[PDB]
Scaffold this active site. Structure first.
Site, PDB file in Angstrom:
ATOM      1  N   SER A  43      42.139  42.996  35.819  1.00  0.00           N
ATOM      2  CA  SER A  43      42.459  41.574  35.983  1.00  0.00           C
ATOM      3  C   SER A  43      42.855  40.869  34.692  1.00  0.00           C
ATOM      4  CB  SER A  43      41.285  40.794  36.589  1.00  0.00           C
ATOM      5  OG  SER A  43      41.089  41.062  37.975  1.00  0.00           O
ATOM      6  N   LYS A  46      46.142  38.761  34.187  1.00  0.00           N
ATOM      7  CA  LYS A  46      46.407  37.495  34.860  1.00  0.00           C
ATOM      8  C   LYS A  46      46.638  36.361  33.868  1.00  0.00           C
ATOM      9  CE  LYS A  46      44.211  39.055  39.111  1.00  0.00           C
ATOM     10  NZ  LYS A  46      42.923  39.399  39.779  1.00  0.00           N
ATOM     11  N   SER A 101      40.078  34.853  39.128  1.00  0.00           N
ATOM     12  CA  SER A 101      40.597  36.212  39.217  1.00  0.00           C
ATOM     13  C   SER A 101      41.216  36.510  40.584  1.00  0.00           C
ATOM     14  CB  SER A 101      39.536  37.251  38.838  1.00  0.00           C
ATOM     15  OG  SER A 101      40.138  38.315  38.124  1.00  0.00           O
ATOM     16  N   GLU A 137      48.607  44.098  42.927  1.00  0.00           N
ATOM     17  CA  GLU A 137      47.250  44.120  43.464  1.00  0.00           C
ATOM     18  C   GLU A 137      47.257  44.648  44.893  1.00  0.00           C
ATOM     19  OE1 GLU A 137      45.165  42.060  40.189  1.00  0.00           O
ATOM     20  OE2 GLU A 137      44.679  43.524  41.749  1.00  0.00           O
ATOM     21  N   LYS A 205      39.402  36.126  29.788  1.00  0.00           N
ATOM     22  CA  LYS A 205      39.797  36.657  31.090  1.00  0.00           C
ATOM     23  C   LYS A 205      39.180  38.039  31.241  1.00  0.00           C
ATOM     24  CE  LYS A 205      41.224  36.877  35.147  1.00  0.00           C
ATOM     25  NZ  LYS A 205      39.906  37.544  35.354  1.00  0.00           N
ATOM     26  N   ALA A 208      37.928  44.243  35.984  1.00  0.00           N
ATOM     27  CA  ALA A 208      37.115  45.354  36.449  1.00  0.00           C
ATOM     28  C   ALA A 208      37.980  46.251  37.316  1.00  0.00           C
ATOM     29  CB  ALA A 208      35.904  44.875  37.247  1.00  0.00           C
TER      30      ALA A 208
HETATM   31  C1  LIG Z   1      40.174  42.022  38.343  1.00  0.00           C
HETATM   32  O1  LIG Z   1      39.900  42.924  37.557  1.00  0.00           O
HETATM   33  N1  LIG Z   1      39.725  42.057  39.515  1.00  0.00           N
HETATM   34  C2  LIG Z   1      39.738  40.865  40.370  1.00  0.00           C
HETATM   35  C3  LIG Z   1      38.327  40.540  40.882  1.00  0.00           C
HETATM   36  N2  LIG Z   1      37.505  39.837  39.854  1.00  0.00           N
HETATM   37  O2  LIG Z   1      37.000  40.663  38.916  1.00  0.00           O
HETATM   38  S1  LIG Z   1      36.955  40.236  37.441  1.00  0.00           S
HETATM   39  O3  LIG Z   1      36.166  38.990  37.332  1.00  0.00           O
HETATM   40  O4  LIG Z   1      36.336  41.296  36.612  1.00  0.00           O
HETATM   41  O5  LIG Z   1      38.337  39.987  37.006  1.00  0.00           O
HETATM   42  C4  LIG Z   1      37.658  41.799  41.434  1.00  0.00           C
HETATM   43  C5  LIG Z   1      37.757  43.003  40.502  1.00  0.00           C
HETATM   44  C6  LIG Z   1      39.189  43.297  40.071  1.00  0.00           C
HETATM   45  C7  LIG Z   1      39.973  43.840  41.236  1.00  0.00           C
HETATM   46  N3  LIG Z   1      41.247  43.474  41.332  1.00  0.00           N
HETATM   47  O6  LIG Z   1      39.428  44.599  42.029  1.00  0.00           O
END
Ligand SMILES: *C(=O)N1C[C@H](NOS(=O)(=O)O)CC[C@H]1C(N)=O
Length: 260
Positions: A43, A46, A101, A137, A205, A208
């Site tokens: 993420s 973003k 996110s 995504e 930012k 995961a």
């Molecule tokens: C980004 O990595 N993602 C979006 C969402 N939020 O997670 S974050 O706060 O670590 O950014 C879920 C995890 C991940 C995804 N796209 O699965």
């Protein structure tokens, strides 16, 4: 050598691979650990995609309402799922992507830039020849061993975030809009912010992904000092591995205490 030893021991302690790059804007001092090794960015893109959208669009275009269908909604779209009827502007989409996110918001930003390859083009324009962007995504979070799709390095992400926020590449209004979106969000509370001394404001930012991927990129404003840019990336070695936020918080403490 002492800072390097701490990162080696964090990798052992958390059974993980760790990438670190930080720059103190006031002294030009840097701290680096595996700074050129590739990690899935998850993420963290973003905030960079939002910055690129701000750069390339007039205030009029950024306030125009976009409408999207229920079929554009992917998993983890807490904001965009509420606004099928009203639509959202690129400004609102950028805020949702950075603060919460939101994955559909991330996809709309990538689309506005011409898809993943257009987003990569926007990064090449600011000098980043390292980041490789290929998927939308949620496929972009697979973090498969050996795969370079949707990867960057700690040095490249830190340098990109510095370019958009501290190198005077965005006008004051767009720059402050961008950094305000990065400040005060719950997604960052256990990451670089948890390693920063109280009073050192953190805009970040998080990210995961699979294989235990856990990332955070941030600007840090210490009292009475110039800002610090910090990128900390990590993953583990099996597909289902669970990450531990404390790895990022502890790595951030090493960075911020040593750049102190
Ligand atoms: C980004 O990595 N993602 C979006 C969402 N939020 O997670 S974050 O706060 O670590 O950014 C879920 C995890 C991940 C995804 N796209 O699965």
């Amino acid at each position: 050598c002492i800072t390097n030893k701490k990162f080696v021991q964090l990798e052992k302690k958390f059974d993980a691979r760790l990438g670190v790059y930080a720059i103190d804007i006031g002294s030009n001092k840097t701290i680096a650990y595996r700074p050129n090794e590739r990690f899935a960015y998850a993420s963290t893109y973003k905030v960079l995609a939002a910055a690129a959208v701000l750069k390339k669009n007039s205030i009029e275009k950024l306030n125009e309402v976009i409408h999207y269908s229920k079929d554009d909604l992917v998993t983890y779209s807490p904001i965009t799922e509420k606004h099928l009827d009203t639509g959202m502007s690129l400004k609102e989409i950028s805020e949702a992507a950075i603060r919460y996110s939101d994955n559909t918001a991330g996809n709309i930003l990538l689309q506005q830039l011409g898809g993943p390859k257009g987003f990569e083009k926007s990064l090449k324009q600011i000098g980043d020849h390292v980041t490789k962007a290929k998927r939308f995504e949620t496929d972009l979070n697979s973090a498969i061993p050996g795969d370079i799709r949707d990867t960057s390095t700690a040095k490249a992400l830190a340098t990109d975030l510095k370019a958009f926020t501290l190198d005077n590449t965005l006008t004051t209004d767009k720059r402050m809009i961008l950094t305000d979106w990065m400040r005060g969000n719950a997604t960052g509370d256990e990451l670089i912010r948890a390693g920063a001394p109280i009073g050192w404001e953190v805009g970040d930012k998080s990210g995961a992904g699979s294989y235990g991927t856990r990332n955070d990129i941030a600007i840090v404003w210490p009292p009475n000092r110039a800002p610090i840019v910090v990128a900390i990336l990590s993953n583990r070695f099996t597909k289902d591995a669970n990450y531990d936020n404390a790895l990022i918080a502890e790595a951030a403490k090493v960075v911020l205490n040593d750049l102190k």
